[PDB]
């Protein structure tokens with residue numbers, strides 16, 4: 001059962017990494033513009049219930065990938081199924097720091113299920 005949890009997190013991790021890898025490259029002309037948008041970051045992200053903070057930013061994440069031209073739909077399903085009122089850090093981040101943050105979170109939980 002925690003096997004299913006771990007596999008779901010791995011799928012989350014890979015999906016988030018595919019997005020980051022997709023946008024964070026010089027073959028992407030819209031990168032500079034994409035980095036102007038602000039993403040809100042979890043005040044704390046140490047438990048699965050903290051994924052609420054991710055779920056609440058999936059729509060803007062989608063919008064910014066949109067206005068720069070699904071994985072998101074799959075991420076949304078995984079997040080809902082893995083997943084408390086969300087507390088956000090005071091300073092916002094770029095789409096790249098946002099993704100890197102939730103990639104680290106995902107890797108962290110995965111390791112505590114090994």
Ligand SMILES: O=C(O)c1ccc(COc2cccc(Cl)c2Cl)o1
Pocket residue numbers: 004007008011073074075077078
């Ligand atoms: O339909 C989806 O998007 C969906 C359902 C579960 C998941 C997470 O990934 C998984 C987790 C656990 C098992 C399996 Cl076989 C998959 Cl593919 O994605």
